[PDB]
Amino acid sequence: RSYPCDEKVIAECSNRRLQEVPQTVGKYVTELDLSDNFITHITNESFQGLQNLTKINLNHNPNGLNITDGAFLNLKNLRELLLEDNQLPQIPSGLPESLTELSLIQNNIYNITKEGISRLINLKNLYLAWNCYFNCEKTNIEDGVFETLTNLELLSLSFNSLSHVPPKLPSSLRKLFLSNTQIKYISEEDFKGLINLTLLDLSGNCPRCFNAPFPCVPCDGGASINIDRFAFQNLTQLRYLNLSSTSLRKINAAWFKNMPHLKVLDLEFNYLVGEIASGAFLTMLPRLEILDLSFNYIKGSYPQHINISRNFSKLLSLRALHLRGYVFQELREDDFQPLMQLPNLSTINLGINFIKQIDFKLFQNFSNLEIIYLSENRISPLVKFDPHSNFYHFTRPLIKPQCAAYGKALDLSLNSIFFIGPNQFENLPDIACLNLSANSNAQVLSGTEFSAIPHVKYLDLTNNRLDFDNASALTELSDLEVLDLSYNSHYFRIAGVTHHLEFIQNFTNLKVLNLSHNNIYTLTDKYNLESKSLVELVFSGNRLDILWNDDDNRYISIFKGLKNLTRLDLSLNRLKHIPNEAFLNLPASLTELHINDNMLKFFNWTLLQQFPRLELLDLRGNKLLFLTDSLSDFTSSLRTLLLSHNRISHLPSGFLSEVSSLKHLDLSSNLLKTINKSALTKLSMLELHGNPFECTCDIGDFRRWMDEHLNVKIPRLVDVICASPGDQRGKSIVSLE
Amino acid sequence: RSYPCDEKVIAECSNRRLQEVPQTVGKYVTELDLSDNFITHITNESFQGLQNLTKINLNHNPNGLNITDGAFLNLKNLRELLLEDNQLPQIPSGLPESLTELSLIQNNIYNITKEGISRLINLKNLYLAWNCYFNCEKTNIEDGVFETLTNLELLSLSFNSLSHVPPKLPSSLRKLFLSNTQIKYISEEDFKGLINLTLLDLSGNCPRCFNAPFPCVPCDGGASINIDRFAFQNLTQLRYLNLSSTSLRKINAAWFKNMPHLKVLDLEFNYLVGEIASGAFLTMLPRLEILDLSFNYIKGSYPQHINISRNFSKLLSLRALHLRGYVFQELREDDFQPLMQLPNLSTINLGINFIKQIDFKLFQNFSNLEIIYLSENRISPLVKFDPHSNFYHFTRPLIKPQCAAYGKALDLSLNSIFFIGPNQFENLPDIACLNLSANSNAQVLSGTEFSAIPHVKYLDLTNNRLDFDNASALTELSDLEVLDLSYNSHYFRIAGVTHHLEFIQNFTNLKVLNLSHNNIYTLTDKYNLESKSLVELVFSGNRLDILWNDDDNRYISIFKGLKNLTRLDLSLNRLKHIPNEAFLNLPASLTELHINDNMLKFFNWTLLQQFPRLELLDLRGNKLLFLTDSLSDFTSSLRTLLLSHNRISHLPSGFLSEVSSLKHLDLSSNLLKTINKSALTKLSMLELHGNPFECTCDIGDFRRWMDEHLNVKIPRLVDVICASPGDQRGKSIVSLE
Ligand SMILES: *[C@@H]1O[C@H](CO)[C@@H](O[C@@H]2O[C@H](CO)[C@@H](O[C@@H]3O[C@H](CO[C@H]4O[C@H](CO)[C@@H](O)[C@H](O)[C@@H]4O)[C@@H](O)[C@H](O[C@H]4O[C@H](CO)[C@@H](O)[C@H](O)[C@@H]4O)[C@@H]3O)[C@H](O)[C@H]2NC(C)=O)[C@H](O)[C@H]1NC(C)=O
Ligand SMILES: *[C@@H]1O[C@H](CO)[C@@H](O[C@@H]2O[C@H](CO)[C@@H](O[C@@H]3O[C@H](CO[C@H]4O[C@H](CO)[C@@H](O)[C@H](O)[C@@H]4O)[C@@H](O)[C@H](O[C@H]4O[C@H](CO)[C@@H](O)[C@H](O)[C@@H]4O)[C@@H]3O)[C@H](O)[C@H]2NC(C)=O)[C@H](O)[C@H]1NC(C)=O
Ligand SMILES: *[C@@H]1O[C@H](CO)[C@@H](O[C@@H]2O[C@H](CO)[C@@H](O[C@@H]3O[C@H](CO[C@H]4O[C@H](CO)[C@@H](O)[C@H](O)[C@@H]4O)[C@@H](O)[C@H](O[C@H]4O[C@H](CO)[C@@H](O)[C@H](O)[C@@H]4O)[C@@H]3O)[C@H](O)[C@H]2NC(C)=O)[C@H](O)[C@H]1NC(C)=O
Ligand SMILES: *[C@@H]1O[C@H](CO)[C@@H](O[C@@H]2O[C@H](CO)[C@@H](O[C@@H]3O[C@H](CO)[C@@H](O)[C@H](O[C@H]4O[C@H](CO)[C@@H](O)[C@H](O)[C@@H]4O)[C@@H]3O)[C@H](O)[C@H]2NC(C)=O)[C@H](O)[C@H]1NC(C)=O
Ligand SMILES: *[C@@H]1O[C@H](CO)[C@@H](O[C@@H]2O[C@H](CO)[C@@H](O[C@@H]3O[C@H](CO)[C@@H](O)[C@H](O)[C@@H]3O)[C@H](O)[C@H]2NC(C)=O)[C@H](O)[C@H]1NC(C)=O
Ligand SMILES: *[C@@H]1O[C@H](CO)[C@@H](O[C@@H]2O[C@H](CO)[C@@H](O[C@@H]3O[C@H](CO)[C@@H](O)[C@H](O)[C@@H]3O)[C@H](O)[C@H]2NC(C)=O)[C@H](O)[C@H]1NC(C)=O
Ligand SMILES: Cc1cc(-c2[nH]c3ccc(C4CCNCC4)cc3c2C(C)C)cc(C)n1
Ligand SMILES: Cc1cc(-c2[nH]c3ccc(C4CCNCC4)cc3c2C(C)C)cc(C)n1
Ligand SMILES: *[C@@H]1O[C@H](CO)[C@@H](O)[C@H](O)[C@H]1NC(C)=O
Ligand SMILES: *[C@@H]1O[C@H](CO)[C@@H](O)[C@H](O)[C@H]1NC(C)=O
Ligand SMILES: *[C@@H]1O[C@H](CO)[C@@H](O)[C@H](O)[C@H]1NC(C)=O
Ligand SMILES: *[C@@H]1O[C@H](CO)[C@@H](O)[C@H](O)[C@H]1NC(C)=O
Ligand SMILES: *[C@@H]1O[C@H](CO)[C@@H](O)[C@H](O)[C@H]1NC(C)=O
Ligand SMILES: *[C@@H]1O[C@H](CO)[C@@H](O)[C@H](O)[C@H]1NC(C)=O
Ligand SMILES: *[C@@H]1O[C@H](CO)[C@@H](O)[C@H](O)[C@H]1NC(C)=O
Ligand SMILES: *[C@@H]1O[C@H](CO)[C@@H](O)[C@H](O)[C@H]1NC(C)=O
Ligand SMILES: *[C@@H]1O[C@H](CO)[C@@H](O)[C@H](O)[C@H]1NC(C)=O
Ligand SMILES: *[C@@H]1O[C@H](CO)[C@@H](O)[C@H](O)[C@H]1NC(C)=O
Ligand SMILES: *[C@@H]1O[C@H](CO)[C@@H](O)[C@H](O)[C@H]1NC(C)=O
Ligand SMILES: *[C@@H]1O[C@H](CO)[C@@H](O)[C@H](O)[C@H]1NC(C)=O
Ligand SMILES: *[C@@H]1O[C@H](CO)[C@@H](O)[C@H](O)[C@H]1NC(C)=O
Ligand SMILES: *[C@@H]1O[C@H](CO)[C@@H](O)[C@H](O)[C@H]1NC(C)=O
């Protein structure tokens, strides 16, 4: 059995509290990840007899790291070497020339000398970020240090006190990163011989200090980055340009004269309100797809409308427009006239703009609109950290891909819609995906509210105060497949009416329903509970304990009518015990059942006979004390059984040698002391970490079983620690002799 | 020493896990509180030799309670008897006739018979609430059961299935409570002989269901409470009338014809929008002081303005007007014209109305306005449970009394003020108290924002995103005494500027400052830190650990400048150790010092010599392991010393016999095993509960000290449990022989 690393050939050996490099690693290993360990020393004997290695990860070691000269030199096949967050005072000496990837981020490297990297001619990707950052005083770049690296495609020098663009850069460069490098002025000679440059990042130089995870210092006298007219004169191949947080007031149109392939342009966190109103540079970008002009607002300025230049109609290739934090009161049809002529424009981002009123008729004017993002605005009822991240642009999808896949998406979440008005969805396009999350919506749903958009397939109504007790609630949305009513708190509770879940029956296509954290302790559905389409139900964070503890036993067949249900989540329901009759009434069509994070003192395993389709049973975070011995007689379909964070002290005799269908069995964080031969198949995984094991002679039977059943993978063996005796405490069960 | 009760003559014996009534109670005791105990049986021998008792509290027993016939009959001086939440099936038989107060709330009493209460002629206050509630089917009231009780002033029958008003009620009645009693119709004969009635509560009968902590069922066909024109024709002495949640659409003015003393009128949770627009009943209330018409809104109706009847000018005695949940878009000067002529109107409650715009010039039109409550509205930047509770009306003060005491109060909390506009406080009265809490205000304070109201003495700016790095921040408010910047998260952090607390110096009257949970780990104030007015600083939930762990020791005199400081809160600062030099730099003028809920491993008691005014030292929730023996040489002013929730295993020899000024010493929830004679004055209190005491022969020395020092009060002796041996485990240290 592979110890302490997990073989897959890639060997995962990260976060295992290793004080030194393990010599128990196989010679056949090509990739070794030793990150997040307490390793302090690296020598030539650390990777002895490992010529087959290509990738070595030694990040965040310890919790600095001492590396001898030519410690990696013996490895002729080493191509990737990650040495991030190691507190290295300089570049490691005698590095192998075979390297193509090198990452030296978050170290104390203040000098980029020829003695360290000039020998490495095979380097393709080089990362030297967060080295001389707020310590430093200036990063010493040796004259023509990168000139010898003629095969360098990517060079990241971001987050370093540079002041000036490094001279004598290789012509092979395709991606250049110089973010937060204190470079105030850019000249024509800075990017002269870079004919193959596709990416240029100059963000955070003379910045507009906002919500940043890193220290921000703006330039003296509110100064902007000074870029010469002829600075980007020979960057014909540039596709990506990042000029975020550069305190720009004006954009010279001449910068894009010899730039006809520009695909992405980042201009967020600048002072360009005037440039948005009249932009000459907009006629210079016919191949631009993504444009970000976010958080460009004037401090204390709340205008009536957004001033969009007519030159926005010249952006023929535009697919995405990000106009967050412009801050304006009203959006009219006339204001967005230049964008209406754009054929590829599918995404509009108007989040965090505090817009009070929008003339929603303007969105059906667009040719190919797919995403309308209006989150964190003020629309009211209408009546009659990691360094390898994009810090200034949001990479996360604006709408959940599950929602957006159905069709036209509209996000009206975190607004002032405290009730759905009769003209709320007036003159709106054919929306298939709608988000009305955290609007504090206290609407009594009757089946008249969503009449204007009756083709919604995915509806997010989370964190509201909605009333869906009426049988005709949401019935106007016949094509509805997904309904998310998570964290909904009833504001007009009626005894003998709340909760009335009769509305779900009327839907012919509703497959996914989530009424989690709704605080359902009362049901009034006289007849239970039919839905021939529903496959997934999330009933987590409710009060099933109250419902099933009922003296009259009224809610005994609460989910019996859902004869198509495959997944059921009953977690966080404060369940101490499930009545035998109530469990038998659960749909026999279930494949996945979650009863985790409850207070279950006991569980009737015999009742599993009425569930012949059950493959997954989640019983984690409960108060279960014992297990069954005759599990084979109750189940023959169960594949995954999660019993972690329980009070199981003994494994019954003939448990593993009963269930033939079982593959994954989690018994971690329990009260197991020993595993016997009698208790000891198609099992592929067995979790046992965080158990108080007695490392004596009684554990010997289970150790022999581990060597006899090598295929049964036991994860994180280092966390399978002995509780007693004192001399064996701390050590792993596999480390015994 | 009094055990298990604490003598004060009133004997507190509540929540002490008592399975039976203690016989160790003194005969001199007049008041005994045995509530929240596990007592199951009550007999005539339970209170034997206690003739001096007047008040007995047996509430929430157990966690029902079995009482024998005439168990209390032997007590001739018993006047008050509380028997709440005891699961009593009927009224206790053979109760003493001497009783004046009786509470039988939250029991299973379904019958009010003559055999139980008719003998009790001395009864003044009777409470029979939550007895026949949602079980029941109807509460059986015997004909003329209350008729014999000719001395009854208060009768509460609230939360019981009554259906009809009980006939033959005593003429002595001053307060009648009939809330949520299923009484749909009120006739002239219901309150005929009640000439001395001052209070009538009929709330929750035919209700408008809302966020109620109790079950709510509205009347059939949206029915309102039917009150006869002459139903209140003889209630001339009525001062308080509660008609909340009665689904009223119209108020008959005839109900107040013979009611000239009505002081308070509750009409919340009804459908009286039309009545507010035109109310004939308003001319019938000249002596009315408090009027509540909250949550009267029309469902789905968001009107442009509030329609206030001109008859509101006839409410000459009005002091408070509560108009929450009316729901309207804009408030104009003309809309509040009838209220402007009212001389006593001091409080206006317009909370939860979603008002987008208010013409703030209308508030200076009022004669004696003191409280302007506009919380939970939509004002944006202006540019160029217990049964004895009032369930329908808010009893809590609208503005904190400490704020309101300074003068005219304005509450604009939980609104849309994301920045302070130039016309935000345009045409506003002389405000001395302002609340701008939870507005998500990201304003860069410069000293121009609060220009229109420069007489603010108390300013609440909690839960915002404010920037106060500018030295001229809030300096326009020269008379400012209290500034609350709690939970403020800086949205625009600048390295070398954030945090800059230079603004505090300019204030000549700032006494109290609260910058708690501001996450202050960086300071840039080149010179520390003068303020000759500040007496209290709350620096809790910050990062003093980072500030004092500084390699250059820049923030060593962080609070030295505040030469008037008496109270300093340094809790939740993640402090593991305080540097000796940094502690000496704290103000000598201090009287109260809180360093609680930190991670302090050690504390230098010697440094207390530079603090001759220190009376209170809070060191709770820390990791302190040992104490000093020569405390007398370091302090002679210390009165209170809180050391609870620490790791103190030993009390040094000559600790109590050193500090003569010490009165209160808390050593609870520690690791103390025994207290010696050598370690064993003006001490009045000594806390030691939750300590692992070794109840052997070594504890005997401390037990003798307890009997010798009876004046040194040890609270909750039942919680001072032995850890070892097994036979003594669970028992109290005072229970040993
Ligand atoms: C200024 O603006 C520029 C341009 O917008 C930004 O540049 C981007 O920066 C991000 C973050 O550093 C880059 O993202 C990284 O891309 C790597 C390559 O992935 C591409 O190629 C593979 C195939 O080889 C595709 O599968 C994939 O879809 C991509 O097309 C990834 O390897 C990186 O992944 C990392 O994160 C993930 C998720 O956490 C981990 O699982 C990985 O292990 C890994 O650590 C990452 O996604 C992006 O490529 C850059 N743009 C371009 C065009 O190259 C600047 O960041 C921005 N500056 C600032 C300061 O904001
Ligand atoms: C209310 O309840 C609903 C229903 O449960 C919730 O919606 C589901 O949320 C889960 C996440 O919690 C979604 O599942 C995730 O989908 C990701 C994307 O799936 C597509 O892409 C992958 C490839 O990347 C394909 O294999 C797949 O077939 C899909 O086409 C997956 O990447 C996620 O997988 C990862 O996490 C899971 C654990 O969650 C691991 O088991 C995986 O190994 C993997 O690491 C994941 O499956 C799900 O799609 C959502 N469903 C719907 C209909 O939206 C709501 O979120 C919930 N609401 C609230 C507020 O709680
Ligand atoms: C930011 O920081 C400030 C300053 O610390 C906080 O404001 C103070 O908050 C405390 C409570 O946390 C307030 O103290 C309370 O005052 C009440 C009223 O006292 C006045 O009236 C009595 C007579 O009724 C006078 O004797 C007294 O001198 C005052 O004039 C008291 O009733 C309270 O007592 C309760 O607590 C004590 C223990 O502290 C118990 O012994 C009592 O039995 C009782 O239960 C209490 O003393 C204080 O007045 C506030 N000051 C100001 C200026 O507002 C802010 O709350 C804080 N902000 C946030 C968001 O945390
Ligand atoms: C409807 O609108 C609401 C509100 O706008 C929206 O809720 C938001 O959902 C997102 C996505 O689920 C939440 O963001 C997440 O935040 C957690 C931390 O709290 C992160 O872990 C998430 O992922 C990050 O980390 C991953 C790596 O582990 C990355 O791969 C990934 O790119 C992320 O960086 C994620 O960011 C967000 O917190 C909520 N907001 C609120 C207010 O609830 C909801 O999802 C919308 N629904 C639909 C159908 O669009
Ligand atoms: C309907 O309105 C009336 C009048 O406003 C409400 O009466 C008030 O009820 C509360 C709680 O029962 C009383 O307060 C209690 O007073 C005692 C004695 O002072 C005190 O010991 C308690 O701690 C508590 O403060 C209050 O006195 C009483 N008002 C009057 C003038 O008697 C009634 O509660 C309302 N009904 C509902 C269901 O909301
Ligand atoms: C300024 O406005 C805010 C927001 O309304 C005020 O905060 C509110 O403070 C009160 C207590 O003073 C909290 O209400 C209740 O407190 C009782 C305990 O006294 C508790 O039992 C209730 O459950 C409830 O919490 C209220 O939650 C709190 N609101 C927020 C958002 O924090 C603030 O006190 C006002 N300041 C001044 C100076 O008036
Ligand atoms: C001086 C000034 C401040 C702001 C201002 N105040 C805010 C309050 C909250 C938030 C977000 C809202 C959603 N959740 C996270 C925080 C954003 C802002 C902004 C802008 C858009 C950055 C706007 C203007 C015009 N002037
Ligand atoms: C159908 C309908 C619903 C509402 C409606 N929506 C709300 C959302 C939140 C809150 C509060 C706000 C502060 N925090 C606690 C909850 C109150 C309301 C109300 C009223 C006043 C009850 C209003 C009208 C006219 N029609
Ligand atoms: C690094 O290791 C070498 C091993 O020869 C040792 O001589 C040197 O002192 C070590 N340096 C540090 C900083 O640990
Ligand atoms: C770009 O470089 C080429 C090669 O030296 C040259 O012909 C061309 O004139 C340069 N562009 C500009 C605008 O100077
Ligand atoms: C984007 O627009 C161009 C015309 O400007 C068009 O040729 C191209 O096909 C569009 N892209 C897509 C993905 O359709
Ligand atoms: C927007 O739509 C309206 C109505 O169809 C039309 O009159 C107007 O010309 C459109 N404008 C643009 C630029 O799409
Ligand atoms: C349920 O919705 C329908 C449709 O609007 C409405 O007629 C009916 O009155 C609603 N039910 C209740 C109880 O209000
Ligand atoms: C769920 O219902 C659909 C029809 O709406 C059906 O195709 C599917 O097979 C059903 N699932 C099960 C497991 O019966
Ligand atoms: C399981 O439930 C059945 C009834 O459905 C009952 O006969 C059996 O005794 C139960 N077993 C346990 C362990 O409670
Ligand atoms: C109450 O106590 C008496 C004591 O004489 C006993 O006879 C009776 O059975 C008890 N009843 C209950 C319900 O505990
Ligand atoms: C009730 O009021 C009427 C009219 O004022 C009066 O005639 C009658 O005597 C009153 N009854 C009592 C009991 O006061
Ligand atoms: C309330 O108003 C009346 C006149 O309607 C007046 O006589 C009385 O003094 C006022 N109350 C107070 C407390 O001033
Ligand atoms: C309100 O104040 C304005 C301006 O002083 C005045 O013209 C108007 O008559 C006032 N109205 C009332 C009813 O107080
Ligand atoms: C500080 O406030 C003053 C007064 O408005 C302003 O002139 C000054 O520019 C502010 N400081 C900064 C750094 O903006
Ligand atoms: C503040 O300190 C000065 C020092 O001269 C003193 O005169 C003044 O009384 C103090 N004020 C308060 C409120 O303690
Ligand atoms: C307390 O601090 C002083 C210096 O101010 C030092 O001499 C003394 O040793 C310290 N005592 C402890 C217990 O650290």
PDB file of N, CA and C in Angstrom, chain B residues 187-207:
ATOM      1  N   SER B 187     -72.052  42.540  21.934  1.00  0.00           N
ATOM      2  CA  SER B 187     -73.369  43.136  22.169  1.00  0.00           C
ATOM      3  C   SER B 187     -73.329  44.185  23.292  1.00  0.00           C
ATOM      4  N   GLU B 188     -74.432  44.949  23.455  1.00  0.00           N
ATOM      5  CA  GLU B 188     -74.591  45.989  24.480  1.00  0.00           C
ATOM      6  C   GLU B 188     -74.575  45.422  25.908  1.00  0.00           C
ATOM      7  N   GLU B 189     -75.047  44.166  26.076  1.00  0.00           N
ATOM      8  CA  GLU B 189     -75.127  43.454  27.354  1.00  0.00           C
ATOM      9  C   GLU B 189     -73.803  42.810  27.810  1.00  0.00           C
ATOM     10  N   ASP B 190     -72.787  42.753  26.924  1.00  0.00           N
ATOM     11  CA  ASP B 190     -71.478  42.153  27.220  1.00  0.00           C
ATOM     12  C   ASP B 190     -70.666  42.917  28.279  1.00  0.00           C
ATOM     13  N   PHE B 191     -70.695  44.263  28.234  1.00  0.00           N
ATOM     14  CA  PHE B 191     -69.991  45.125  29.190  1.00  0.00           C
ATOM     15  C   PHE B 191     -70.971  46.144  29.800  1.00  0.00           C
ATOM     16  N   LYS B 192     -72.124  45.645  30.285  1.00  0.00           N
ATOM     17  CA  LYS B 192     -73.188  46.465  30.864  1.00  0.00           C
ATOM     18  C   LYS B 192     -72.824  47.080  32.219  1.00  0.00           C
ATOM     19  N   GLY B 193     -72.578  46.234  33.220  1.00  0.00           N
ATOM     20  CA  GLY B 193     -72.266  46.670  34.577  1.00  0.00           C
ATOM     21  C   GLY B 193     -70.802  46.892  34.892  1.00  0.00           C
ATOM     22  N   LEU B 194     -70.016  47.363  33.904  1.00  0.00           N
ATOM     23  CA  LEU B 194     -68.583  47.624  34.066  1.00  0.00           C
ATOM     24  C   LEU B 194     -68.292  49.132  33.967  1.00  0.00           C
ATOM     25  N   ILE B 195     -68.828  49.897  34.935  1.00  0.00           N
ATOM     26  CA  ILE B 195     -68.706  51.358  35.029  1.00  0.00           C
ATOM     27  C   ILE B 195     -67.289  51.843  35.390  1.00  0.00           C
ATOM     28  N   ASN B 196     -66.449  50.982  36.001  1.00  0.00           N
ATOM     29  CA  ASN B 196     -65.091  51.352  36.407  1.00  0.00           C
ATOM     30  C   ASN B 196     -63.985  50.816  35.472  1.00  0.00           C
ATOM     31  N   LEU B 197     -64.369  50.269  34.293  1.00  0.00           N
ATOM     32  CA  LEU B 197     -63.441  49.717  33.298  1.00  0.00           C
ATOM     33  C   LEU B 197     -62.567  50.803  32.677  1.00  0.00           C
ATOM     34  N   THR B 198     -61.235  50.644  32.775  1.00  0.00           N
ATOM     35  CA  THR B 198     -60.235  51.559  32.215  1.00  0.00           C
ATOM     36  C   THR B 198     -59.532  50.930  31.012  1.00  0.00           C
ATOM     37  N   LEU B 199     -59.427  49.587  30.977  1.00  0.00           N
ATOM     38  CA  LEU B 199     -58.793  48.859  29.876  1.00  0.00           C
ATOM     39  C   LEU B 199     -59.693  47.763  29.318  1.00  0.00           C
ATOM     40  N   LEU B 200     -59.757  47.676  27.980  1.00  0.00           N
ATOM     41  CA  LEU B 200     -60.483  46.641  27.256  1.00  0.00           C
ATOM     42  C   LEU B 200     -59.637  46.171  26.083  1.00  0.00           C
ATOM     43  N   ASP B 201     -59.233  44.897  26.121  1.00  0.00           N
ATOM     44  CA  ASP B 201     -58.413  44.273  25.091  1.00  0.00           C
ATOM     45  C   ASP B 201     -59.243  43.218  24.361  1.00  0.00           C
ATOM     46  N   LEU B 202     -59.509  43.456  23.068  1.00  0.00           N
ATOM     47  CA  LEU B 202     -60.281  42.557  22.205  1.00  0.00           C
ATOM     48  C   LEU B 202     -59.495  42.215  20.932  1.00  0.00           C
ATOM     49  N   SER B 203     -58.168  42.426  20.971  1.00  0.00           N
ATOM     50  CA  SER B 203     -57.244  42.166  19.868  1.00  0.00           C
ATOM     51  C   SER B 203     -57.170  40.690  19.461  1.00  0.00           C
ATOM     52  N   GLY B 204     -56.881  40.444  18.185  1.00  0.00           N
ATOM     53  CA  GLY B 204     -56.739  39.097  17.643  1.00  0.00           C
ATOM     54  C   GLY B 204     -58.023  38.316  17.455  1.00  0.00           C
ATOM     55  N   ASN B 205     -59.180  39.002  17.488  1.00  0.00           N
ATOM     56  CA  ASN B 205     -60.490  38.384  17.282  1.00  0.00           C
ATOM     57  C   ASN B 205     -60.952  38.756  15.879  1.00  0.00           C
ATOM     58  N   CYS B 206     -61.002  37.744  14.979  1.00  0.00           N
ATOM     59  CA  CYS B 206     -61.213  37.840  13.525  1.00  0.00           C
ATOM     60  C   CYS B 206     -59.947  38.540  13.006  1.00  0.00           C
ATOM     61  N   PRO B 207     -58.760  37.894  13.068  1.00  0.00           N
ATOM     62  CA  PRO B 207     -57.533  38.632  12.756  1.00  0.00           C
ATOM     63  C   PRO B 207     -57.074  38.677  11.304  1.00  0.00           C
TER      64      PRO B 207
END
